[PDB]
Design an enzyme around this catalytic site. Sequence first.
Site, PDB file in Angstrom:
ATOM      1  CG  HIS A 166      -5.735  -2.667   1.246  1.00  0.00           C
ATOM      2  ND1 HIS A 166      -5.076  -2.203   0.139  1.00  0.00           N
ATOM      3  CD2 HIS A 166      -5.104  -2.157   2.319  1.00  0.00           C
ATOM      4  CE1 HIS A 166      -4.116  -1.368   0.533  1.00  0.00           C
ATOM      5  NE2 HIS A 166      -4.109  -1.349   1.856  1.00  0.00           N
ATOM      6  CB  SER A 171      -1.002  -0.052   1.196  1.00  0.00           C
ATOM      7  OG  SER A 171      -2.103   0.786   0.875  1.00  0.00           O
ATOM      8  CG  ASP A 221      -7.154  -2.699  -2.254  1.00  0.00           C
ATOM      9  OD1 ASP A 221      -7.682  -1.925  -1.442  1.00  0.00           O
ATOM     10  OD2 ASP A 221      -5.897  -2.825  -2.418  1.00  0.00           O
TER      11      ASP A 221
END
Length: 261
Positions: free
Chosen positions: A210, A132, A178
């Site tokens: 995610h 991320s 996600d």
Amino acid sequence: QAANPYERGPNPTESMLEARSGPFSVSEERASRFGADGFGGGTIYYPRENNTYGAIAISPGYTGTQSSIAWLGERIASHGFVVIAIDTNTTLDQPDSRARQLNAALDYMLTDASSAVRNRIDASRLAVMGHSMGGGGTLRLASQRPDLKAAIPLTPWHLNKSWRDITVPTLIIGAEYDTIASVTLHSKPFYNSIPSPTDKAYLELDGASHFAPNITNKTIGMYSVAWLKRFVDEDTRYTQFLCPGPRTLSDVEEYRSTCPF
């Protein structure tokens, strides 16, 4: 023209790449938060066998810590790599900050880790990865450091959508469902911006949230190790997994690449 000097371990199979651990026994060394300059410390996983290997630094995402990514550092090290899973200076650090900290971590493995760590690293063969905002940091570092051999952003998040200057072999792994770093706004724009002739691939995990990269995941494990083997070790025994690559009805939603590289 000779056997590849960076080849390590047995001839690979899908079964072997999907297993929880590869064929090298691993040891750990702490990078102390009380001794790591420019990042938050972390754990270095490395092969017990005394040979040299490529070195990889991995960043967690926002609110994340080295434990978010530890399984992956361990699993990758068990295939013949030296890998640091980092903590950031704060858990709220932004992607560009994570990029400087992945840079610091590389430097740490090379200069400040124990002799045992440093003696096992081929300093010329490095790569970075990250989840991320950590995958945003990976893209930024890749852009700034074309000497790196590979970059693997995992469900990446970054406000800059254009990475047209990346020349490092990059595998972006996105997650279909996600809800935080949607592939529509992050991963696909990032991958679509990288021009020929850079080698790259996009692999979107079917059904994935995610947080898939924070739990042991045979698809992330296999394809991250295949990518690092092909680009950090130049190990063409691993091309077969990458090219033509995953069947796309399966655990991969979509796979795009510049095979055969």
